Design a protein around this ligand. Structure first.
Ligand SMILES: Nc1nc2c(ncn2[C@@H]2O[C@H](COP(=O)(O)OP(=O)(O)OP(=O)(O)O)[C@@H](O)[C@H]2O)c(=O)[nH]1
Ligand SMILES: [Mg+2]
Ligand SMILES: [Mg+2]
Ligand SMILES: [Zn+2]
Lengths: 158, 263, 83, 104, 85, 94, 37, 1111, 8
DNA sequence: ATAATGGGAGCCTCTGATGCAG
DNA sequence: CCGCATCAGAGCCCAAAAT
């Protein structure tokens, strides 16, 4: 068991799923500038489309592994529960997916790259907001939880 | 009021708070005997209250009393009793302890579930009183005082002392702790296996309950002293007797990582 | 009456428990007025005094248990079965 | 006997004095030259006990054959120095003062 | 003003040294030595005496003095008890 | 795992009572120099030194092993506490 | 932890409190809902 | 070896001088090299000009000067002195009454000087001043959270230079003003400025209900003077509203250009936002006897126009990096300088009201003590003045470029939440999004971006290239964040043919929002990918392939790399490792062209074209703050011809001028028998044999001998009751000889102290009489080696009193310092990491015969478990390994820039060329394919790795291009059942080493009041068994173990003493007694006048003081 | 509420 | 120990419980 | 009688702790 860069296998299905997503995205743009859908409605539709495309590419990653390469290292570690989960594996061989703005609302443009293909400085930066937000969430939680636990011990200790 | 190393004096804030109080009381006694007007006696009296107030709870009412040229409020009795740094949560519900040590942890695949790697240099200190007695029973030193004198210099330690220590720790356990201790398995009991080297060796199966990595984690060691403590540790606190989560009832010591991968 | 864990903790009969939790002065002033007695029922009280806590090997159920070997039980027993 | 209960209660001014071994009459702490405690000050040995075990301040009575004697010359009890952790003093206020806990 | 009480005249002498050094430092463009102060103070004063005077004038420091960022460390905590065996 | 730990938990109504019985038994043995033991010379726990085999010094090991034999009697209010002490120091001096 | 009847003397409240607190770290409502309750 | 660089991006400008944020800031403040008449009014000059003239008599400021430093830098570090210059000031005394003029130059003390690399020497220790981010002064408008249709206008000045103002509009309709947390109707203040009802109606009125809602008749019923008295009574109840007193308060609070300072940036931001021009930095003026408004009405005007929805009015985003500015060293120090100057002025006004209004000069009128203390206070106790990080050269360079939102004038660690910690869209190109602390400080402490520079106003600017039409110029524009938002900025990697944009659609940003745009719309373009990241982040090759959370650890850990004696630069670099050594100043370069005259271990002499024979001494084995050895080694030979700027000596952790934080090792990625578990690392004993990962460390020991009231401490070779074996390595005077090995317990410096009145107890007296040896006058206080420490004695410094140049603190006769060095081989428990955030502790060192090895006999160096990769998502290490394989056999190193790098096909080309050397050698040497290579090849085609039906050579090459090789287990000789990834990786030995961290205590020092063990290794502390540990013992029901922790192992004094005696006697430990910290608690409640009583079952008192506290 | 102000 | 001297300087966020207020 | 507001209380553990 090892990991080389070629062990992150871009599924052939990916290019197909990406072409499908762009024609869908174009159809939603025609309905905006023509006044068929609002700004709210257009953004809601874009995020939903990309959610489904992500799921699509994941199943493709795991199908390609199971059928044509069942002993692939990433696959083996993830499936056995030794390490890895679908979303991390999807980011290695798939697309990175939707990233979040500093606020909480999601960027419409996703990261099409995978860590095997490599990101663009702009994609890298877009992703950083969520990274930082996660770290701050976690930091303030360990403190809130710590306090909670102490309350609990004090109320039940007798 | 203590003389530190350098001959300098270090003193508790309470002394300055009392001194303020004593002065105002004394001046008040003098002003009364000398028959000052009520406005003056009134100012002295109100200053006296404020001085009492800072001594008991400083900052509670009004401006905090401070030492000159410092913003630090002086530490009053209320501050001593209460808070994270207060008497209760610092010295009363928890304490620093003797017979304890700490080092970096390292994985020990070869260990049985009930064992740990313990650096020999750590073990000699933790069991130091025991080692002295054993050094007298056999013969490495004439008496307890000479034996202690020999361990002080590291080059004065002969090789028979290491075998002597092995006899001491037979069948005994030590406690391993890794902070944070979130549930009762942050502490478990292990039979120590003496090792050369500066690292603590931890059994692979317990890393989850401890949330331990080898990215540089350190753990603390404790020595239960009495027969009662040792009995509690070996029966109740031993790693091998705690295999299931008290929370879910599910297995806690279970395959992970390489073990799953291999099977 | 339903109260959250913090308030509930502060309301326990034991004033050593409450004052070591939080609101230390408030707990202590109300306790001192009342002339309150802590019966040392729970864990925190005994921890503070350094006592043997009322759980595990310290529970009164197991605390007083005796051990004696048969080579001694019968020996002691024969001498006393007489006047 | 064994401790089964802990009571906490208000202290009368009489009782505060029932604890006290002396009135601290002076803001002085320790003498700048001798470094010994100032008489009637915050560290006075005549109030709170001897600095050295079973040894008085001026050194007329220096060992444990006398325990409980109070030296006539310097006024210090001959006992264990540990008592400086236990024995209380008091200050006699000219006008009464409220205890802030019971106000604020 | 001092935790360790000082005779009123002695405080005055010390203050003289303060002024003196402050003058000496203002003309010399640098801190004076014990000897430069001992000369400036006149007869009876050598460098040894200037030092002893300063030793006496040192005020104690709080055991509760903070060390570091986090307000969770006291100076007194690093001081062993040398009295009890 | 301690040898035969499952059977030991079997003998008691509360796991903590096992610890009490074991701990008290180990103290009895240490004070009296092991000569009150119910074990037989070949059942005695042994420890391998560089010299060779010696008696296991650890009384907690001894106490659990003795318990497994069945030769020990455990319970509450079996005998006045002081009287036991005199009878044991009479049978097995210090 | 022993998959068998609890022993008299087990300090059960503390175990209850540790069991509830330990997962707190990894809760993403989230932990605020737990505290609200 | 050859160095092959990839990447097509042509960077038009080099990285700016990296410490310039420090060096340039302080130079701007001091202006020491500027002639006084030519000084601009800024920094120190501006501080003086602000405090003077001092009115009564008038004392006026002429000019200042800075002298030369009394002692050089090396000398200051040696003697524990501050590196500083004497400051003098020319002052002229004037008499407003008389005409008298006396002028003199008064000495204000010393000011610390910054070294060449941007740091300070404060009392012998090197220090750094960290820049502070904060809110820029100005006028901001934010939406009011309570009322969804109303807004609050906040006027914020520079910190501590005035109050915060709030202009909320209350529900009643009148516009309210908030000052020092107190509110009143704003109309009243407007009347004081001399405004009339007409002006407010005519100026605004356009807003029907709002301008009329501000109007209150009662206020108008009074001239501007009467309204001023009315307001003052609102702000200061009980203070008599004297007309000169009211003016004084309002002037000092609002109009005084001494007590109220908007920034220079505040002025620009206010002028730019409200579209007005400010005559000064104050909100109003006192002119022709009354008050004249400047700011207030425009701020009110903007607020009302915004509430309506008038074009051109927006709310301000307060985290935008245009409204957030940096306070650098000069500014931080100058603020503290301004405080010290104002205190000195207090002394002046007070001295001008006492001792005779005539016989006074400026030298007697000025006491400089307040000024020296303020500056000394900042440089020694500020929480922006930090102990220098000089673990390796990158440590300090990074430290100087750090930005803190904490400190004196900023958030508390508790007082901070998400909006501030976020990565703002404007951080692009300015503040690194990666390099931040993990944990509580996340987002507060950051690092300056590589191409960023701080302008004069304190805003961070970042470079972009102009694009006109479709042609990209070479003109670079540094932009602030607000100015950047105006244009459409294309990405730096967008395709170019020549200077022309070669793509029909380009990737660009408009206000940070990514957008696809045609080349006709492109106004600017990014200079480089490097401009987005910090210096540490820019050192991570294949960064585009790493998940950010792990990339962070890569950055931060390079800071922690320990300098190795064999240190090498990585085989895969990014091209910045050259610049870092040069800007760090660790490395030595040639001033002009010349010829090398002499080369030594201690020095290098160069003969230049000028003819001058410049001699460069080399720093050899100097101990840094963190104890790593800073040492420079000669890189040139006698007679070598050098050009200008060529390398002379390598600094620490540098190899031929490239940053060397670690070593390049041959790594195999595979589990190994559980020694790899959970990030632990297995290493070959070959690493120690060849001294890879060995580093030098020096610890300094110090001891004072001082005068006591009992007699002098003496440092002597004569120490009571010690054998000559115990003193052999000590010199005549009692100091250990230079070049001796010292181990724990050994004497470093012998010292005696006079025995206290503890003058031996009668017990010791009788014993002493038996042996016929008088109890000695002195006791043995000798300085000894702490447990676990030791090494070779490399130096001794001895400083007595009465020796030239030295005076110690009062009472101290002499100080002896001993410097002890140690060579540290890598060992089990030391910590390693690479640049991608893979980090781990050494769990196993195998002898070379157990190591997995290549078919040709070469063993691997490090074995890393693959389980660390998939969840962590840091793949740069994988690509790094592959390119590292090619370079191992081709004998080359690479430069792969970030985001413009070596890509997969190109790595493959190189890997094929390598295979030829790994295999073609073999076929010529007369060996064919191995039996085991076939067995592995079988397993590999079952995996789909190789195509079935090819020769063994074709299949091995197919694997080699996937970066996998056949690997034999050294234990069995049998192959690993699969092909394994093998290559060269750059791995560093971090600063966390077991030798430093292992600690244990039986008994030891106790605390004074609590009688509990002390803390920390240096104090021989006990471990803290805290609140949560007690819970664990409680849940287990281990009552006696817990009680031991609570009594015998801590503060139960009778118990802890008795227990030790029992163990040394072989008896069992006694039942514990009352813990002493409980008795402390009881007495403390008595001191609060509370009666705490321990009672028995009969409710009778129990005495836990055993009669000692009752009379 | 301010002891100086009261006294003044 | 004796010209006369007359009123001060200074600066986060949550939840919970108690006192003035349309 | 009901809301508002003002005040006072809390806000993870251990190790380092370069004064
Ligand atoms: N309370 C507290 N605990 C910390 C802190 N920093 C680190 N820890 C400990 O560090 C551990 C981090 O473990 P991780 O490596 O992230 O464990 P993981 O979830 O398996 O993550 P991966 O190894 O990537 O899978 C936690 O389990 C904590 O116990 C801190 O600042 N505060
Ligand atoms: Mg870890
Ligand atoms: Mg982990
Ligand atoms: Zn006497």
């Amino acid at each position: 068991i090892t990991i080389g860069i070629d062990d992150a296998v871009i599924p052939e299905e990916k290019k197909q799923y990406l072409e499908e997503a762009d024609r869908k995205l174009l159809q939603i743009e025609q309905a905006y500038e023509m006044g068929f859908l609002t700004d709210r409605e257009r953004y809601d539709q874009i995020l939903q489309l990309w959610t489904e495309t992500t799921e699509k590419v994941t199943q493709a990653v795991f199908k390609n592994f199971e059928e044509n390469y069942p002993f692939n290292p990433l696959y083996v570690m993830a499936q056995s529960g030794a390490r890895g989960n679908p979303q991390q594996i999807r980011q290695l061989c798939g697309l990175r997916g939707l990233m979040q703005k500093p606020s909480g609302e999601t960027f419409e443009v996703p990261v099409r790259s995978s860590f095997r293909e490599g990101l663009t400085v702009l994609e890298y930066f877009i992703s950083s907001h969520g990274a930082r937000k996660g770290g701050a969430d976690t930091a303030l939680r360990t403190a809130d939880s710590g306090y909670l636990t102490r309350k609990l011990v004090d109320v039940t200790h007798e | 009021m203590v003389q530190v190393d350098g001959g300098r004096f270090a003193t508790s804030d309470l002394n300055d708070l009392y001194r303020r109080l004593i002065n105002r009381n004394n001046r008040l006694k003098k002003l009364l005997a000398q028959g000052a007007p009520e406005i003056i006696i009134r100012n002295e009296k109100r200053m006296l209250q404020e001085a009492v107030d800072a001594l008991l709870d400083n900052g509670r009412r009004g401006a905090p009393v401070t030492n000159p040229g410092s913003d630090r409020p002086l530490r009053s009795l209320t501050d001593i009793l209460s808070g994270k740094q207060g008497r209760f949560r610092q010295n009363l519900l928890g304490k620093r302890v003797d017979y304890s040590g700490r080092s970096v942890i390292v994985v020990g695949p070869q260990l049985k579930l009930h064992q740990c790697g313990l650096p020999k240099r750590m073990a000699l200190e933790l069991f130091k009183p025991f080692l002295l007695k054993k050094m007298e029973e056999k013969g490495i030193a004439p008496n307890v005082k000479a034996a202690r004198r020999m361990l002080e210099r590291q080059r004065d330690i002969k090789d028979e002392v290491w075998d002597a220590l092995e006899e001491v720790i037979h069948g005994k356990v030590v406690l391993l702790n890794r902070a944070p201790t979130l549930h009762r398995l942050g502490i478990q009991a292990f039979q120590p296996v003496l090792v050369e080297g500066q690292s603590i060796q931890l059994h692979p199966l317990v890393c989850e309950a401890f949330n331990a990595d080898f990215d540089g984690d350190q753990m603390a060691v404790h020595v239960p002293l009495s027969s009662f403590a040792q009995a509690e540790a070996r029966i109740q606190m031993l790693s091998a007797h705690n295999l299931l989560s008290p929370a879910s009832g599910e297995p806690l010591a279970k395959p992970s990582r390489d073990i799953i991968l291999g099977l | 009456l339903l109260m959250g864990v913090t308030k509930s903790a502060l309301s326990t009969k034991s004033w050593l428990s409450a004052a070591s939790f939080q609101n230390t002065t408030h707990v202590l002033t109300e306790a001192a007025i009342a002339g309150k007695k802590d019966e040392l029922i729970g864990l925190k009280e005994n921890v503070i005094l350094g006592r043997l806590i009322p759980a595990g090997t310290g529970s009164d159920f197991v605390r007083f248990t005796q051990v004696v070997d048969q080579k001694t039980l019968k020996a002691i027993e024969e001498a006393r079965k007489e006047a | 006997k064994e401790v089964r209960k802990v009571r906490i209660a208000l202290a009368s001014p009489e009782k505060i004095r029932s604890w006290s071994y002396g009135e601290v009459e002076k803001p002085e702490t320790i003498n700048y030259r001798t470094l010994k405690p100032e008489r009637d000050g915050l560290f006075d040995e005549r109030i709170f006990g001897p600095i050295k075990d079973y040894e008085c301040a001026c050194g007329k009575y220096k060992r444990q054959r006398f325990e409980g004697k109070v030296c006539e010359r310097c006024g210090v009890e001959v006992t264990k120095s540990i008592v400086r952790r236990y024995r209380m003093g008091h200050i006699e206020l000219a006008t009464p003062a409220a205890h802030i806990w019971f106000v604020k | 003003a001092r935790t360790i009480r000082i005779p009123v005249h002695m405080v005055e002498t010390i203050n003289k040294l303060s002024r003196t050094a402050r003058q000496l430092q203002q003309e010399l463009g640098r801190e004076p030595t014990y000897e430069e102060i001992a000369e400036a103070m006149g007869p009876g004063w050598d460098a040894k005496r200037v030092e002893e005077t300063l030793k006496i004038a040192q005020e104690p420091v709080s055991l509760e003095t903070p060390i570091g960022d986090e307000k969770d460390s006291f100076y007194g905590d690093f001081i062993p008890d040398e009295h009890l065996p | 795992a301690e040898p035969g730990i499952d059977k030991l938990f079997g003998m008691v109504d509360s796991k903590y009572r096992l610890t009490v019985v074991v701990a008290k038994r180990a103290q009895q043995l240490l004070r009296h120099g092991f000569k009150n033991t119910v074990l037989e010379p070949e059942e005695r726990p042994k420890m391998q030194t560089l010299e060779g085999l010696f008696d296991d010094p650890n009384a907690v090991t001894w106490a659990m092993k003795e318990l497994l034999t069945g030769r020990l009697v455990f319970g509450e209010n079996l005998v006045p506490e002081d009287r036991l002490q005199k009878e044991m120091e009479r049978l097995y001096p210090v | 932890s022993m998959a068998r009847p609890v022993s008299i003397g087990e300090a059960v409240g503390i175990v209850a409190a540790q069991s509830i607190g330990e997962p707190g770290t990894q809760l993403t409502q989230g932990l605020p809902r737990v505290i609200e309750l | 070896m050859e160095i092959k660089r990839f990447g097509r991006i042509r960077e038009v400008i080099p990285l700016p001088p990296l410490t310039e944020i420090q060096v340039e800031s302080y130079r701007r403040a001091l202006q020491a090299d500027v002639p006084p008449e030519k000084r601009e009014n800024v920094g120190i000059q501006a501080a003086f000009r602000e405090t003077f003239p001092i009115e009564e008599l008038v004392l006026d400021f002429l000019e200042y000067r800075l002298g030369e430093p009394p002692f050089p830098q090396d000398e200051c570090r040696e003697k524990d002195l501050t590196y500083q210059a004497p400051l003098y000031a020319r002052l002229q005394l004037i008499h407003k009454d008389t005409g008298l003029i006396k002028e003199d130059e008064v000495f204000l003390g010393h000011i610390p000087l910054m070294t060449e690399d941007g740091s300070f020497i404060i009392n012998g220790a090197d220090r750094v001043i960290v820049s502070q981010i904060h809110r820029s002064p100005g006028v901001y408008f934010t939406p009011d959270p309570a009322r969804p249709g109303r807004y609050i206008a906040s006027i914020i000045p520079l910190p501590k230079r005035g109050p915060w103002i709030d202009l909320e509009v209350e529900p009643n309709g009148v516009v309210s003003m908030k000052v020092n947390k107190r509110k009143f109707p704003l109309v009243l203040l407007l009347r004081v400025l001399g405004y009339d009802q007409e002006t407010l109606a005519r100026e605004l009125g356009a807003y029907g209900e709002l301008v009329q809602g501000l109007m209150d008749e009662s206020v108008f019923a009074m001239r501007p003077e009467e309204a001023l008295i009315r307001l003052f009574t609102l702000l200061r109840p009980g203070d008599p509203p004297k007309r000169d007193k009211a003016v004084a308060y309002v002037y000092g609070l609002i109009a005084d250009p001494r007590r109220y300072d908007l920034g220079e940036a505040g002025r620009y931001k206010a002028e730019e936002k409200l579209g007005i021009r400010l005559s000064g930095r104050t909100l109003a003026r006192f002119e022709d006897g009354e008050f004249k408004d400047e700011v207030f009405l425009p701020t009110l005007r903007y607020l009302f126009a915004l509430t309506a929805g008038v074009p051109g009015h927006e709310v301000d985003d307060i985290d935008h990096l245009g409204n957030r500015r940096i306070r650098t060293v000069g500014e931080l120090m100058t603020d503290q300088f301004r405080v010290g100057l104002a205190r000195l002025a207090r002394g002046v006004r007070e001295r001008m009201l006492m001792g005779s209004e005539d016989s006074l000069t400026p030298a007697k009128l000025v006491n400089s003590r307040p000024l020296e203390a303020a500056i000394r206070e900042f440089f020694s106790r500020s929480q922006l003045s930090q102990f220098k990080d000089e673990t390796n050269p990158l440590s300090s360079l990074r430290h100087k470029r750090r930005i803190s939102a904490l400190g004196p004038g900023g958030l508390t660690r508790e007082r901070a939440g998400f909006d501030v910690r976020d990565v703002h869209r404007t951080h692009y190109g300015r503040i690194c999004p990666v390099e931040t602390p993990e944990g509580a400080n996340i987002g507060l402490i950051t690092s300056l971006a590589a191409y960023a520079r701080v302008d004069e106003l304190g805003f961070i600017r970042t470079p972009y290239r102009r694009v006109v039409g479709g042609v990209v110029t070479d003109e670079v524009v540094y932009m602030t964040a607000t100015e950047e938002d105006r244009y459409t900025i294309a990405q730096a990697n967008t395709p170019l043919e020549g200077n022309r944009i070669a793509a029909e659609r380009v990737v660009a940003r408009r206000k940070g929002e990514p957008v696809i745009v045609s080349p006709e719309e492109v106004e600017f373009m990014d200079v480089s990918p490097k401009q987005v990241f910090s210096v540490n982040t820019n050192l991570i090759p294949f960064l585009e392939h790493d998940d950010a959370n792990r990339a962070l650890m890569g950055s931060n850990m390079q800071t922690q790399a320990v300098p190795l004696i064999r240190a090498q630069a990585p085989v895969v670099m990014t091209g910045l490792e050259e610049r870092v050594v040069r800007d760090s100043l660790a490395a030595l370069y040639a001033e002009e062209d010349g010829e090398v005259a002499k080369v030594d271990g201690n020095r290098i002499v160069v003969r230049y074209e000028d003819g001058r024979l410049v001699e460069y001494p080399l720093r050899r084995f100097y101990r840094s703050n963190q104890g790593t050895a800073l040492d420079q080694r000669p890189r040139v030979v006698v007679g070598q011809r050098v050009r200008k700027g060529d390398l002379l000596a390598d600094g620490p952790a540098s190899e031929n001028g490239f940053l060397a934080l670690g070593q390049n090792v041959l790594v195999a990625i595979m589990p190994f028998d559980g020694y790899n578990f959970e990030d632990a690392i297995v290493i070959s004993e070959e690493l120690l044999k060849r001294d890879f990962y060995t580093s030098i460390h020096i610890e300094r020991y110090e001891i004072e001998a001082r005068d006591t009231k009992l007699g002098p401490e003496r440092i002597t070779r004569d120490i009571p009751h010690l054998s000559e074996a115990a003193l052999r390595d000590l010199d005549e005077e009692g100091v250990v000889r230079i070049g001796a090995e010292v181990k724990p317990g050994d004497i470093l410096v012998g010292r005696t102290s006079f025995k206290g009145e503890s003058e031996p107890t009668p017990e010791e007296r009788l014993l002493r009489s038996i042996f016929g040896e008088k109890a000695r006058d002195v006791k043995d206080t000798s300085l000894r080696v702490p447990p676990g420490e030791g090494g070779i004695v490399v130096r001794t410094v001895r400083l007595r009193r009465g020796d030239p140049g030295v005076e110690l603190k009062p009472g101290v006769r002499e100080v002896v310092r001993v410097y002890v060095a140690q060579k540290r081989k890598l060992q089990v428990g030391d910590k390693l990491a690479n640049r991608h955030g893979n980090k781990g502790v050494v769990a196993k060192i195998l002898p070379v015969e157990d190591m997995p090895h290549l078919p040709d006999g070469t063993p691997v160096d490090v074995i890393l478990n693959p389980l660390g990769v998939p969840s962590r998502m840091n793949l740069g290490q994988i690509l790094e390994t592959h390119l590292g394989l090619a370079g191992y056999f081709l004998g080359q190193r690479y430069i792969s820039p970030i985001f413009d790098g070596a890509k997969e096909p190109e790595i493959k080309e190189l890997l094929a060329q390598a295979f030829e050397v790994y295999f073609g050698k073999r076929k010529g040497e007369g060996f064919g394919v191995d039996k085991r290579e076939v067995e592995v090849l079988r397993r590999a085609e079952k995996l789909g790795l190789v195509t079935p039906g090819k020769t063994p050579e074709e299949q091995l090459k197919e694997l080699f291009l996937q970066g996998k090789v056949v690997l034999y287990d050294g234990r069995t000789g049998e192959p690993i059942e699969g092909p394994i990834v093998v290559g060269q990786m750059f791995i560093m030995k971090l600063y966390h080493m077991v030798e430093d961290k292992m600690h244990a205590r039986s008994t030891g020092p106790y605390s004074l009041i609590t009688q509990q063990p002390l803390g920390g290794k240096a104090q021989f502390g006990g471990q803290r068994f805290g609140e949560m540990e007690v819970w664990a013992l409680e849940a287990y029901g281990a009552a006696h173990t817990l009680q031991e922790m609570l009594t015998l192992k801590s503060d139960d004094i009778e118990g802890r003493n008795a227990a030790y005696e029992a163990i040394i006697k072989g008896e069992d430990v006694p039942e514990p007694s009352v813990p002493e910290s409980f008795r402390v608690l009881v007495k403390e409640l008595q001191a609060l006048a509370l009666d705490v009583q321990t009672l028995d079952e009969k409710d009778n008192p129990v005495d836990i003081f055993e009669g000692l506290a009752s009379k | 509420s301010d002891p100086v102000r009261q006294y003044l």
